[PDB]
Amino acid sequence: NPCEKHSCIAVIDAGSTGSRLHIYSYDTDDTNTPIHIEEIWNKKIKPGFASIQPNSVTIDAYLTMLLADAPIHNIPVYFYATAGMRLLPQSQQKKYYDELDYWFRQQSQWQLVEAKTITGNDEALFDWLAVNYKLDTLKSVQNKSVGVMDMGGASVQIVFPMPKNAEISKHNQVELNIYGQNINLYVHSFLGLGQTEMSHQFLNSPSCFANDYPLPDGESGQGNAPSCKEEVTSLMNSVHKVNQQIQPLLALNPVNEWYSIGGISNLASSQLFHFENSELTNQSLLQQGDNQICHQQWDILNGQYPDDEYLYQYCLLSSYYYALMVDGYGINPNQTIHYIPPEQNLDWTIGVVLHRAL
């Protein structure tokens, strides 16, 4: 048990498509800020917590599956839900949290600290801290601006350094002091533009599916990534105005290196895509989705690649990522976007470990 010799904390990422428990060991520097954060336990379950029947047996059984076989129980627990919960009104969210609190009260060891729906802006903050912790970029003052994107099921986040800015909402900015350095960041989350939610607007778009993919309306896929992308852009910009909100700011605060986490790490890492050095460009991403999924015959492709439950979405997802990043945020199609490998289990929960101590 590492927790006999180190501080330990459990943090649950209750995301829109599933929940992930992490138990971290850590030490602390002279200011009691965590260092040496190591993941000592990970368990993931599907589907998302906000998706399940809000009754007591359903909620208790889910929590049981997530938590009951954890090797270490007598530690602080944070259960933080993101955009899956944000789709529900507060009265309906309360049902899940009242049951969750009771479940925890009936367990011996666990110290529930907080169980709540975090704002998209806090999610963004935790996204940035988690990625910069992993990159080892927090302990000294950086020459260069690191931006972070998190592609979730129901929201997406974008977060990048920006000096305190009176022209921008207080709610879209965060100042923090960590490892003795002061950092101001712009933060934004877009609810409804996550992959699952976005996809439900385009399931009958033949451009967004491989040739002869059976669309729900009985028609056939006729894939064309540029056309699928255009359709997605209409939701990004004509509907949500992502371009108007993000591009003028990004122009004035250029990012030197972009890191992405969430569904895009899984796509980019799949067997259908070819990228080197865990990094991609949007131009390459759209060209590979177009050639390798959109223009392929669905029954043939599905037989060639049997193991990937997401295969059928890859024409649409490659088009959406481009739509979001290039037409929405205004990122150059030829700009390198780093993604973190899925095996690293990096989500924004490390940000919680660090942020509570500041």
Which residues are near a second copy by CB under 8 A? 47, 51-53, 58, 83, 86-87, 89-91, 117, 119-121, 154, 169, 171, 189, 191-192, 197, 200-204, 214, 216-219, 231, 234-235, 238-240, 309, 312
- Between residue 117 and residue 176, which ones bind Mg ion under the rule CB under 5 A? 152
Looking at the DSSP assignment, which residues form a beta bridge with residue 7?
A: 26
Side-chain half-sphere exposure of 49, counting CA atoms within 13 A: 35
Q: Is 5 annotated as a binding residue?
A: no
> What is the DSSP annotation of 149-200?
EEE-SSEEEEEEE----TTS-GGGEEEEEETTEEEEEEEEEEET-SHHHHHT
* Minimum CB distance to a second copy, residue 261 (Å): 20
* Minimum CB distance to Cl ion, residue 75 (Å): 28
Instruction: Determine if 53 is a binding residue for Cl ion (CB under 5 A).
Output: yes
Binds 201: which of Cl ion, a second copy, Mg ion, none (CB < 5-8 Å by kind): a second copy
Chain centroid, CA 267 distance in Å: 13
Binds 266: which of a second copy, Cl ion, ligand AMP, none (CB < 5-8 Å by kind): ligand AMP
Binds 9: which of Cl ion, a second copy, ligand AMP, none (CB < 5-8 Å by kind): none
Q: Which CB sits closer to a second copy, 144 or 171?
A: 171
Residue labelled with tokens 């942020």: 355
Instruction: Determine if 51 is a binding residue for Mg ion (CB under 5 A).
Output: no
Among 4, 167, 217, 276, binds Cl ion (CB under 5 A): 217
Instruction: Determine if 107 is a binding residue for Mg ion (CB under 5 A).
Output: yes
Chain centroid, CA 253 distance in Å: 23
Name the burial class of residue 326, with classes exposed (0-12), middle (13-18) and buried (19+) by CB atoms within 10 angstroms of its CB. Answer: buried
Residues belonging to the chain: 358
Short-list 317, 176, 177, CA closest to 260: 317
Q: Which CB sits closer to ligand AMP, 30 or 343?
A: 343
